[PDB]
Amino acid sequence: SMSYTWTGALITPCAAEESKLPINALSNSLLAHHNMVYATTSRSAGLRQKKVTFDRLQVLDDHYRDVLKEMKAKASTVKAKLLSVEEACKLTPPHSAKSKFGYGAKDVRNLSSKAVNHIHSVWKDLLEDTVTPIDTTIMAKNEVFCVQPEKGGRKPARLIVFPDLGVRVCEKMALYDVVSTLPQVVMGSSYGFQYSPGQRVEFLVNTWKSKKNPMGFSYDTRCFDSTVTENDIRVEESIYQCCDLAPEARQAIKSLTERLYIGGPLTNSKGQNCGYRRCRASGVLTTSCGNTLTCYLKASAACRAAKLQDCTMLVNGDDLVVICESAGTQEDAASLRVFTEAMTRYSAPPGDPPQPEYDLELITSCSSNVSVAHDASGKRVYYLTRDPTTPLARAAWETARHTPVNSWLGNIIMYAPTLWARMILMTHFFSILLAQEQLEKALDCQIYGACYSIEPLDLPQIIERLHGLSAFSLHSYSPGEINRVASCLRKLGVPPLRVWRHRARSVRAALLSQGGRAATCGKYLFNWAVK
Amino acid sequence: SMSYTWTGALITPCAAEESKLPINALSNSLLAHHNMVYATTSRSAGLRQKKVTFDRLQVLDDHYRDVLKEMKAKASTVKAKLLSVEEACKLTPPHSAKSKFGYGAKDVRNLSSKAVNHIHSVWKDLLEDTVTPIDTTIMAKNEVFCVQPEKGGRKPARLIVFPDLGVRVCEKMALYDVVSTLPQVVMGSSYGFQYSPGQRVEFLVNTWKSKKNPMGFSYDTRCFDSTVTENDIRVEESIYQCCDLAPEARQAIKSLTERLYIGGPLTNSKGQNCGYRRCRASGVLTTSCGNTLTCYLKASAACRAAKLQDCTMLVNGDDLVVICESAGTQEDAASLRVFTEAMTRYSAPPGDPPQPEYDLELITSCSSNVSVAHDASGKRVYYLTRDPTTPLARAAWETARHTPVNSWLGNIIMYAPTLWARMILMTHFFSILLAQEQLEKALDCQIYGACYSIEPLDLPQIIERLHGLSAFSLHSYSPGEINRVASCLRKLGVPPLRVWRHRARSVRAALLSQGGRAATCGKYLFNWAVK
Incomplete structure (x- = not known):
């Protein structure tokens, strides 16, 4: 089709x-x-x-079927509850698209008459009509x-x-509790969203060290969402159905897949x-869950088809990374191709052909990679990084516009340990916040789904809780990381790392002298600035 | 103790x-x-x-023990998940008490840095310290x-x-999912919060008709909260523990009961x-659940001690109503006393001695009672009522005050089918709303826990969804109901039911002529006003 x-x-x-x-x-x-x-x-x-x-021409085999049966088996150990209209409302994001029926997100979050009523009917319809x-x-x-x-x-x-809002809230009522638990129960450690940047690093690094001769590769599927077959979508439904669900939940899920997901x-x-x-809609509750499940299903079977040894997969969305025992360079190159052969057979053709990697740092998954640095005491510290081009480009843009979303603040938090986030983002923005008076002004920042109201003077506490402290005293970044960053900067025309070291020196001072809380930032976020 | x-x-x-x-x-x-x-x-x-x-001197027996074991058995079929700090935040009420640590409800609902951080530590403390x-x-x-x-x-x-807010949110993280599911799994139809006004009526009326010679009685415990023994609180914990919980959840629940609940x-x-x-704290997530569980436990064992036949209990908080087969008037009077004897033995002494009732309407539970009326077609319609004194008193007060909650609006919705809510509350307030221009202005109304933002022009739709339509055309109220209302009015010095009929007549008109939506109210809420 x-x-x-x-x-x-x-x-x-x-x-x-x-x-x-x-x-x-x-x-x-x-x-x-x-x-x-x-x-x-x-x-x-x-x-x-x-x-x-x-x-899309999809053709399945026993490898696929065995993995799918294995998955259902685990899904059948899951119990999920229906959310009430109210609960589902308190969970809807603050700036979602208004509804074509007279109400918006604020309205939903407030349990307004207009919204609550509409939802209820939208819900009564899902249950009663399962085909339109x-x-x-x-x-x-x-x-x-x-x-x-x-x-x-x-x-x-x-x-x-x-x-549409109304329906979108109904999805939550029916799948919020499933979309949560179910993914992690089926694929255990393979479910990527369970890990924080550092736990991801910890999981990757431990897996990597667990092989005698590690080989890893990320697999990118071409427009994954469009590769998803109705078969795929129905298979997702069958798995959701294996759960212990309320009768009304089953009705809605079935209805939703036939009336929307399919x-x-x-x-x-x-x-x-x-x-x-x-094919897959990008804007439904089920997107991330379904994609993870499907990507994992296919990838698992493909792995078996290629006879990969000691496979360990990390799956996020359509994002996939595999790490296994190398059977020899020429032996791996062949494996990969069989892997991607089976993968396209399952309707998941590659964008750019996967290449086997023997250097963990060179493996990029979820736009990120693992890298090394050393902490104060001098020990090795593994953290997560990514090419800074996009974060920088966007940093720029959001500097020349009010843009109600601070992606920059997001990267500062998610990539606190990195060389670039520390020397540039932090410096550059703590700069502007010092210039203006907006140092105590909270900012709307999105991360791991949620939308937080972050007070700049809290970064130390957040970063610590997220990364550990090492993040304030890391040094000796891998030559490759340092190299990539520096390179990236020339391309984008941004001041060199030495210039930022300077701008930071002052920031650390203007801050240290400006009080206590702000001083605390100067102490921690910019401790590196001076010796 | x-x-x-x-x-x-x-x-x-x-x-x-x-x-x-x-x-x-x-x-x-x-x-x-x-x-x-x-x-x-x-x-x-x-x-x-x-x-x-x-x-408090509590003394247990086998009756108690058997019911408790039965309960645990059912609790052991329940699985509950931990909420994330974020989820627990999106579930905290809009006007809860600020925290003594620099943040409030809005802050929590917004996932602000200050709140989210504090919670996390409050949570790390519960887990680590289980005694202070x-x-x-x-x-x-x-x-x-x-x-x-x-x-x-x-x-x-x-x-x-x-x-305190921080902790309060941590409770949700640990018990929200339990406090929900668990109560209803243990006592089935006996769990009162599962029913809407009409379903409660339906459950009571059906149970009542199911006895050859029904006898019913509500039992009021004297200051129930203060009658709860540490034993009781620990027993609660043991039940919560019977659930399939995450390890971290068990730690917090155990910790919370030793550090707070106990x-x-x-x-x-x-x-x-x-x-x-x-004894029991009135302001913790666990109050309503614990009270329901304990009241049910004791009541069940007490029922067995009194050898009551065909018992069926409806338990809400400390609120309890029992309906059984009458063993004869003199026989029931004795049963009651043995019941209350065993009840006080379990540390649940009575406020005012329970009296057996043979007239369903005379049984008041949760401040309410069942009553009869007839719909348009003339059929019998059972609805839920209550003495209007308090709703009126408060209606008054809230008329000469802003008040964050329109209790009146709450009663208008919860008791829409009642004679008084219809002829007075609706008339009186739709009056003020017509007088002023605040007819489209939403209002904060609390009900069934939640706080809704209600637009007056939506009452028809809400009332319908809640009660059926019959609520717009009921007539021929039981003589006793009509009698009680009228009586209540003299006492409170409020206009007689005939005066309201008039004030309504105009309202129906001012409204019917003022448009469409407002007209719709005039058509439905005030259809009774004129013939």
Whole structure:
């Protein structure tokens, strides 16, 4: 079946779509090559549509079936409860899309009459009608990136398909408790979302050291969401069904998969029919869970097909990393291909061919990799890093706009231990916060799903609880890490690491002298700044 | 063991405390005998303290033990998950008490740095330290009532003991999922909170008709909270422990019961040691669950001790109603006494001696009773009512005050089918809403725990969903109900039912003419007003 079937209708935007990075004298202070940072818009839609639209031919085998039966077996040990309309409401995110029926997120979070009522009926309908395809709207996501000449350079806006607040809350009622527990029960340590940056590192590093001759590789599937077959979606349902669920939950889950998950009609921000979807929707409660489950199912069977030894997989979304015992370089190269052969057979073709890695640091999963540094006492400390291009590009942008989302603050927290987050992000922004008076002003920062209200003067406490303290005194970064960062900076036209060391020196001072709490930041976040 | 040991420290207030009822053109228009409506204050504290302070001598027997083992057996079929700090935060009520550590409810609901951090440590402490008695503050609740020389008029302010935001959220993390599921699994249909007003009526009426010669009685325990023994609290814990829980959950539950539930130090709003508690705290997540469980345990064993036939119990808090087969009037009178004899033996002495009832309407549980009326087609319709004194008194007060909760709106919704809620509350307030312009202005109304933001123009939809429609066309109220209401009004000095019929007539008109939505109210809420 075709992943999508479109219809002349254009995927229209809903507000002003920014294209170029705004020219700020302060942003220039961090990014001079602004003509390399761009945001995606509806205009790319067409390009995107051609990338995600194709026929899927899936063929399963015993490897697949055995893994699936094994999974169901474990799913059958799970018990999940229905959430009440109210609970499901208190769990809906603060800035979700308003509903086409007169109410928004605030309204939901407040248990307003309008919302609560609508939900209830939307719920009564799921239960009573289990066939009418549910409506979803398709949009072109606006995300900031940096040009990459080595290839197409500019990437076409991502496409997001979502069902509508009312329904979206009903999903929670029916699957919130499942989407949670179930993934981790089925794949144990393989379920990536259970780990924090450091626990991820700890799990990867321990697994790596557990092989006599470790070989690892990340596998990237081409437009994973579009590779998901109705078969896949139904298989997910069967697994969810193996759980001990309330009768009403079963009805909704079945109904939701037939009326939404399996696929459905796509419609404009203008209201016109845009086409039909026959693959995964990106905007449903079930997306991450289903993708993890499916990616894991396929990958497991593919591993068995390639006869990989001591496989250990880490799966997040469509994101997948495998680590095993090397059978020899030539032997691994063949394995990989058989792996990817079976993988595409399962309808999960690769984007760029997987390459075997023998150097843990060179393995990138979830856009990140493991690296080494040393702590004060001088011991080895493994932390998680990533190329800083995107975090920087976005840092820039969010410096030249109010942008209600502080991705920068997110990276400062998630990558606190890293060389770049410490010397640049922290410096650069604690700079602006000192300049202005907004040092006590909380900021909305999104991370691990949730949206937090973070007070800058709390970073020390957060970072400590997240990474340990080592994070305030790490040094001697791997030559490769240091090299990549420095490189990245030239490309983006940002001040060199030595300049930041300076800007930090003052920051540490202006802060240390400005009080106690702020001093505490100066002491910890910038302890490295001076000796 | 003494329920409390005080220490000459006064239970101090926290703000201003209104005692007398405020008047105005509007309030007198609904209540003329204002000198009968009063609010409780810290001043009654002393009286209250003497009422709740006494020694408890509990003695158990096989009846108790058999029911307890039966309960555990069912509890052992329950699986409960830990909530994450974030989830527990999104579940904390909007206007809870601020924390003595720099953050409030809004802060918690927003996942602010300050709160999230504190919680985490509060949680790490519960796990690590399982003995230090946790601190709780004691207050004097301010509630509105109507005088009644029926007994020693004027009731002393209720006392509330609570642990503090941080801890309070940790309770949710550990027991939210338990406190939910567990109660209903153990006592099936006996668990009262599972029923809506109508389902309660349906459950009572069905049970009543199921006996050849029904006999029913509500049992009121004297200051139930103070009758709970450490034994009782530990027994609760053992039951919670029978569940399939995460290791961390067990640690916290055990810790919380030893450091909080079991008992602890009480302290002023000023900060001074007020005394020590050795019984149930009124302000913990565990109160309602524990009370239901314990009340049910004792009651069941007491029922067996009294050899009651076909017992069926409905338990809410400390609230208890039993319905059984009558063994004869004289035979039942004896049974009751043996029941209450065994009940006090279990440390649950009666306030006012229980009296056997043979007329379902005369049985009041949860401050309510079942009553009959007829719908449009003329069929019999059973609904739930209660004496309107308190709802009226409070309706008055809240008319001459802003008040964060529209108790009145709560009663209008919970008792929509009742004669009084319909002819007075609805009329009186839709009146004020028409007078002023606040007809579309949502209002904060508390019900079934939650705090909703209700838009007045939505009552029809809510009432319908809650009661059925019959609620808009019921008539021919039992003579006793009509009698009680009318009586109640004279006492409170409120306009007679005929006057309200008039005030309603206009309201129905002013509304019907003012549009569509508002018209819809006029059509439904006031359809009775004119023929």
